[PDB]
Design a protein around this ligand. Sequence first.
Ligand SMILES: Nc1ncnc2c1ncn2[C@@H]1O[C@H](COP(=O)(O)OP(=O)(O)CP(=O)(O)O)[C@@H](O)[C@H]1O
Ligand SMILES: [Mg+2]
Length: 959
Amino acid sequence: QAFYQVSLLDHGRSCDDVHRSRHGLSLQDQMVRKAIYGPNVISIPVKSYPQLLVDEALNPYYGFQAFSIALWLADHYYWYALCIFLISSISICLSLYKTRKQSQTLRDMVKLSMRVCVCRPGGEEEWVDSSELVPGDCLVLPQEGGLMPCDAALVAGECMVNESSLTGESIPVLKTALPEGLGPYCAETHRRHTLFCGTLILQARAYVGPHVLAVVTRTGFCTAKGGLVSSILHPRPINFKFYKHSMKFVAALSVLALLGTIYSIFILYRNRVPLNEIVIRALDLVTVVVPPALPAAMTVCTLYAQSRLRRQGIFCIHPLRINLGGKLQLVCFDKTGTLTEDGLDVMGVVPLKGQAFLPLVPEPRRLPVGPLLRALATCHALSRLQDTPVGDPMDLKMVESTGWVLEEEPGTQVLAVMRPPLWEPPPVPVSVLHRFPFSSALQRMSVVVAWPGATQPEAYVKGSPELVAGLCNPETVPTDFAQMLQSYTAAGYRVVALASKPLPTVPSLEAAQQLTRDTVEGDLSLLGLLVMRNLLKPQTTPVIQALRRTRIRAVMVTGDNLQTAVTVARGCGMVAPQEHLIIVHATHPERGQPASLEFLPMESPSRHLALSGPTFGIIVKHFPKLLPKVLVQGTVFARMAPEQKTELVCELQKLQYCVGMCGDGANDCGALKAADVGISLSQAEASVVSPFTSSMASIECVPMVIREGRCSLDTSFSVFKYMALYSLTQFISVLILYTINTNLGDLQFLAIDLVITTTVAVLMSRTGPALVLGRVRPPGALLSVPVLSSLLLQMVLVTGVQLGGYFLTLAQPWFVPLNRTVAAPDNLPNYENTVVFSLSSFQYLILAAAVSKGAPFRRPLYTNVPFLVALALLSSVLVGLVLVPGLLQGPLALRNITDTGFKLLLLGLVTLNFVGAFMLESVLDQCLPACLRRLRPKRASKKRFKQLERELAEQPWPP
Ligand SMILES: Nc1ncnc2c1ncn2[C@@H]1O[C@H](COP(=O)(O)OP(=O)(O)CP(=O)(O)O)[C@@H](O)[C@H]1O
Ligand SMILES: [Mg+2]
């Protein structure tokens, strides 16, 4: 009767229900469920070519150009029509290629199919089906190096998986068996028992089970790998798109088009040409005003910039966003693996005798056998790859520091058995009973471990110092824990605390392993603090100094302790030594206490604010009025959960800041997607994780993403402004002829539009970006006073030389006056056509050189090379032709002029116009300040960040 959403069909499923779904029906249920859900295939439509063309041809411009071709054919200017078709043909081919390439990349990612082993309710079939996989299907996963087709909760056993594409996470991720329960929660809601579509399985092992077996949850390409590709198809728009502002500027040109049309009507009525004939002249005037090569030129800008970035390694999707890069005002960054260096030496461990802390051991090897050694060795979730161990750089560096070595493939639920170094001045090899994974939001990991001693099993928890110390029973927790940790965090050593609890369970029993994560991480005794050292990436310190110099503010968003983030921030130059840092702190509103905000300064040898994640939680919920003041003044957001990083992005955006994210981790995945410009620095090739994936492991990417964006925004504005200048230069030329004896050209018009303008337009879009990022932001409105001024003033100079030419031509003593008794197509030679075309041809080229204006955002014009050769070549051909048309006289329909003097006068006028155009654009750059000061002495931006800044300047936060 009424359709129900697949999510709505499977939203309320129990923990038990996922196990109920396991060993699902072989065929009848499969077929009906598969029919209801639809086939498990990516929904990218496949088009041979002509299938695309019909859809592609529906664009409104294409219709107008088709009408224009017919109109020009009716006028019998075949040659101009021959060009007008050909330029549209180039436009459609390039648009087709652009569209085809954009789909092809995405389609190539999702073009994967492989034979799958599927479990029957009383069966275990092998390689039976893949694309037809049942929505609730249970399957046995491959042993090693196996891509996972569907998002499936793991019912039994443990899996090691590479999720690098899905989460931006190169490091191997542990997967564990789901626990059946009366409560219903989604596998995604667990966010760990689920195995995600298109993720490689490094290894798969069942300690107790015969093999690892998983039950499919959300599937059919509409979740995970496809859910993101599906996002890339029909993508999210940008608000207040600059094309609207350009569309307003087209309306200013539309007034000029109407004014021209009425001028023509008066001239034609005065001329007394047939009314039927006058309509064709009016129609030609309107069609001429439309530029044929603009639609192609706009594509070629983007395609050249994608080409420029692909070579730099910054692999891009949604190429429209490269301009958005140009406008970004703040760039958010992550601490570890981006601002700092991935991989960290363990700078020893600190042990505690009783309540008191003992002095730090430089090398973890020289310590007594007991809890801390075992915890240091066993806490990690490292697995053994071919002749090697694979894990998180922190956990890997810790175990190598202990000197204990992981046992290989060769009880029941016994895994990752830890072999001792076997050097003595007890070896007691130890085996893990239960593994708990580390979640960035959760901020800790835990293990249950047993030994041949066969005592009560001991649970070891390694996690964030504050949460672990808080979780520990306050018996062992030292009085000065906070102050002692403050030494290590202030130094800049990433610190993780280890807590041990003896657990009263039956040792080496599978059943005994089953336990509540909270119950294992409940009552705890603080054991020691690890002192991991992460060092700043060499290039980070430079890029941040430039981004601060441009006045694009750099905000740091991190899950690590506030003092470490303050040390990294003070190091990079987020906060310079001259600058002052305030630590906003908040007390929870609860019992008899209301919410309190306390601001405490920090002093070290622009009023920068550093906020812990929890303080920001209270500020957003219980101080909404203050949030604008902190988020416009906050530089070092720290101890932030993965969800909190998205909130900073969203609140900074609602304050009208253009955010950017250069994170390299699963924690940032949310923030990267939400942010305007998102860059994932550790990914290989194009990926769905971020809009602008990089393959260089540095912040050196981010300046390049801004620098190219500003170039693409200036190229888009230059190509638009040159296309307007050409059309009005054509309008003036065609009109000067329309008044004067009702004449035009055919082959001449093909030559101008096809060779002079289309070649220059495509070639002017490949200049490339400026060397150094600049203080001045690229101008963002096409309908600006400078742009409008520049175009209008230049067109006056165009007309001046053009009219001057005609006056000089008529004034020439040898000049023979033209017949002016016969139709424009019939009068193949006209003495005026020769002069007007010959003067106008060169000026069409000159406009591009003046328009280029290559300095703040683009490199000097000469550096282009293919443009510069073409400009000179076409100029040389035109110089050659104007002096001596020879053979080309006949095709050009040129009236041969023997007199050298008038040709030199004509060359002089073009040179004068050229000098004029260059002088006008240089004058325009110099004149802007005087104009701006007089037009507006002072103004206030509607955007909230610029006002809140100005308010804070007038009255600061309480000092
Ligand atoms: N394997 C592990 N087991 C337990 N805790 C870990 C851990 N690896 C990191 N931690 C700690 O867990 C907390 C949360 O880490 P999270 O992934 O959110 O950020 P992070 O410390 O990697 C800094 P960044 O945000 O720059 O990536 C931190 O205090 C971190 O030091
Ligand atoms: Mg990271």
